[PDB]
């Protein structure tokens, strides 16, 4: 079993992603839960960089958005390194993960391990280049496809 999803970007831009539940079971299913809902519909990426890690999540920039989800750092199964594409939630130990979340256009050796990696962009990963700063998210989906 597998999971995938999209972020559809306002600006007609697209980054269609793939989730690892072997990754992060929890943080997997916490981010489906919270895009099926439209949680991240007008959600931005409050720091873009352009080239390298983008971090976002936050609503119309307003930092924290209401998820009801918080996470522990976790490491099994699988690597969680920030590699080409590479997707992980934002924390800072056990019990602080939220909904804002990383994407890596270029791998960062000094980010692995550091955040909670439970999925990878797939394609469009150049949108993450091309993006500017406070981008907004327009249709976050995630769906089932093993």
Known sequence: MAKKGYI?????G?????????EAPVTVANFEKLA??????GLTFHRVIPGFVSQGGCP?????????????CETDNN??????????????????????????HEPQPH?????????????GMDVVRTMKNGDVMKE???????
Not at 14 to 22: D, V, Y
Not at 60 to 72: E, L, Q
Not at 111 to 123: I, Y
Not at 140 to 146: G, L, N, S
């Open 14 to 22: 697209k980054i269609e992603f793939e989730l690892f539940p072997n």
């Open 79 to 104: 690597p969680h390194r920030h590699v080409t594409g590479a997707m992980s939630m934002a924390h800072r130990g056990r019990d602080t993960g939220s909904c804002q979340f990383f994407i890596v």
């Open 36 to 41: 099926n809902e439209g949680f991240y519909n």
């Open 60 to 72: 119309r920039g307003n930092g924290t958005g209401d998820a009801g989800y918080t996470i522990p």
């Open 111 to 123: 980010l692995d391990g550091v955040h909670t990696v439970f999925g990878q962009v797939t394609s």
């Open 140 to 146: 976050v989906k995630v769906f089932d496809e093993p």
């Open 8 to 12: 559809l970007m306002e600006n007609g």
